[PDB]
Structure 1
Amino acid sequence: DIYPEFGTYPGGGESPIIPFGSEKNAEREVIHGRWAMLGVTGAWAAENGTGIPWFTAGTLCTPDDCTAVADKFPGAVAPLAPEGSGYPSFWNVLIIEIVLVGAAEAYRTGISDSPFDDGLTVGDVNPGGRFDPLGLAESGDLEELKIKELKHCRLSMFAWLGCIFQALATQEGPIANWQSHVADPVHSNVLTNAAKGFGFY
């Protein structure tokens, strides 16, 4: 069996708890997983590198101050910024964020015409035409690789939901919570935190 766990891939199955409904729901699922995966690994890396929890990283960069981000990146040869000048600013990045992500979005979904105009079809999660220069889509069992990615997608989203609920309850951070649990698993758990209260009880 390809998918021995509880649920099954959309292509074949029944979706036991929630009905399958639209196929756009499956499109969203994959995209949510492909995103949350990047989010979870980014929160992991930010906690490991800087010790700053992900959920307050936005406090760092603000309209008045967005210079602190420059010195955070570990092992960089020169800063992010022009040193004292600190050209990077919240708005400086924001205009860049909105234009670049909006272009990437729209050329993905087909709100605007595809610039690549290379036969790629919008509304498919797996293009496999240009976004795989390495050819791992072409080679190997492509369907099995869709399965693995899906599994990683669902795991990462569930871990993301865990991360947000741990940020709400513990207020410490994902990796800080991981270190607390590993240092002592018996007396550092969700139920131990509930016994102590989540800061509200």
Structure 2
Amino acid sequence: KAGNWLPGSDAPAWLPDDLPGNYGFDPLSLGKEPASLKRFTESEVIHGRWAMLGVAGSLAVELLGYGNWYDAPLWAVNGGKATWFGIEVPFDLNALLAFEFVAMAAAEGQRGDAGGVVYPGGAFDPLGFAKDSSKSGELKLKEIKNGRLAMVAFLGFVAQHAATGKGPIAALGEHLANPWGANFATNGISVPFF
């Protein structure tokens, strides 16, 4: 059990001890049925892996002064052209949409037909790393924890922008500039009244 999310609480028996990231947190009893827990387990890892790439690229663009994650698609909505690392990319939304759809349907289709393989290997695991189970366990715990953290991070970015309309790095600067003046309670949205 990676730990107890709520000290003094008993872990749900349906949660396997080996289950990576098992902090005994299923208060609504969603993973009680084995089939459901199986699907949710794979989905949780997939969500975390995608979010860990989304947070990375959402911070990178801003840090590299290429804009924020929210304003990245506005080129398409306007007459603007597509750029990447400053380099210009010659494609209209329609091209991108069709290209991504086919690419995603192909790779996602192979993953889907496989049968819920959360941890493949070979091409997905070059550089060894997950060859020994002893290392695998801790490496699987680190992936889920970093993924869960990245999922809470992304939601924070979306929520912060929905309340302030600024980029994640731009907020971190506002808060650091005036922590007691710049915070969720001082946005007129998170905490009503005041």
| Residues 66 and 89, structure 1, Cα contact 8 Å, conserved in 2 | no
Question: Could you tell me how far 1:123 is from its partner in structure 2?
Answer: 1.3
Q: The residue matched to 1:54 in structure 2 has which SS?
A: coil
- 2:128 alignment counterpart: 135
Q: The residue matched to 2:173 in structure 1 has which SS?
A: helix
Kindly report structure 1 stretches of 4+ aligned residues shifted beyond 4 Å: none
| Residues 66 and 90, structure 1, Cα contact 8 Å, conserved in 2 | no
- Once structures 1 and 2 are overlaid, which stretch shifts more, 150-159 or 126-135? 126-135
TM-score by length of 1: 0.75
- Once structures 1 and 2 are overlaid, which stretch shifts more, 15-24 or 141-150? 15-24
1:105-134 CA distance string (max 9 Å, x none):
111111xxxxxxxxxx43111112431111
Question: Could you tell me how far 1:94 is from its partner in structure 2?
Answer: 2.0
Q: Alignment RMSD, CA only?
A: 2.5
Looking at structure 1, the residues matched to 160 and 142 of structure 2 have their Cα atoms a distance apart, in angstroms, of 26
- 1:186 alignment counterpart: 180
Looking at structure 2, the residues matched to 186 and 102 of structure 1 have their Cα atoms a distance apart, in angstroms, of 47
| Residues 50 and 73, structure 1, Cα contact 8 Å, conserved in 2 | no
Looking at structure 1, the residues matched to 104 and 177 of structure 2 have their Cα atoms a distance apart, in angstroms, of 40
Q: Which runs of 5+ in 1 are unaligned?
A: 82-86, 111-120
Higher relative contact order (CA 8 A, sep 6+): 1
- 1:84 alignment counterpart: none
| Residues 66 and 88, structure 1, Cα contact 8 Å, conserved in 2 | no
Question: Could you tell me how far 1:5 is from its partner in structure 2?
Answer: 5.9
| Residues 66 and 85, structure 2, Cα contact 8 Å, conserved in 1 | no
Looking at structure 2, the residues matched to 73 and 162 of structure 1 have their Cα atoms a distance apart, in angstroms, of 25
- 2:57 alignment counterpart: 42
1:63-93 CA distance string (max 9 Å, x none):
x7452x32x515xxxx334xxxxx3222222
What is the one-letter code of the residue matched to 1:173?
Answer: G
Structure 1 residues 60 and 50: alpha-carbon distance in aligned structure 2, compared to 1, 3 A threshold: farther
1:32-91 CA distance string (max 9 Å, x none):
1111111111111111123522123222224x7452x32x515xxxx334xxxxx32222
Q: The residue matched to 2:116 in structure 1 has which SS?
A: coil
Question: Could you tell me how far 1:15 is from its partner in structure 2?
Answer: 2.6
Structure 1 residues 90 and 66: alpha-carbon distance in aligned structure 2, compared to 1, 3 A threshold: farther
What is the one-letter code of the residue matched to 2:88?
Answer: L
